[PDB]
């Protein structure tokens, strides 16, 4: 009866040490009036569905059909979306132009 051994499991020393405190606070944005015009956005996602008793689910896709002008009837439909195209435009501008502050020098803030 001889020749044997036993290592086992465990550690040797390792190291962790203690922290050194930390700090992080005070933040804001301020922001202010931005520029106008842009025309950069433009895209669309896929979709598919048939036979449904609900509202809708679309905005604008790639192709050719939307918009119009000629006609003694479509004139009204256009005048309706027209007034809305204005208020909507300003909405998109404030967004794009608003992100310009990230790297610009506007007036006041």
Curated annotation (Swiss-Prot):
Signal peptide: none
Modified residues (Phosphoserine): 21, 24, 59, 73, 97
Residue ranges of the region described as Disordered: 1-82
Any GO molecular function: lipid binding
Induction section of the entry: Strong, by heat shock, by entry in the stationary growth phase, and by cAMP, probably via the activity of a cAMP-dependent protein kinase. By glucose starvation and by fatty acids.
Name of the protein in question: 12 kDa heat shock protein
UniProt entry tagged with the keyword Oxidoreductase: no
Result when mutating residue 46 to T: In strain: Ar5-H12
GO BP term, pick one: cellular response to heat
Residue ranges with Basic and acidic residues bias: 1-21, 28-50, 58-67
Other known facts: Present with 4490 molecules/cell in log phase SD medium.
Gene3D superfamilies, per database record: 6.10.280.100
GO cellular component: cytoplasm; cytosol; endosome; nucleus; plasma membrane
One Pfam family from the record: HSP9_HSP12
Keywords (A to Z) from UniProt: Phosphoprotein, Stress response
Functional description taken from the UniProt entry: May play a role in a switch from carbohydrate utilizing metabolism to fatty acid utilizing metabolism.
Family: To S.pombe hsp9 and C.albicans WH11.
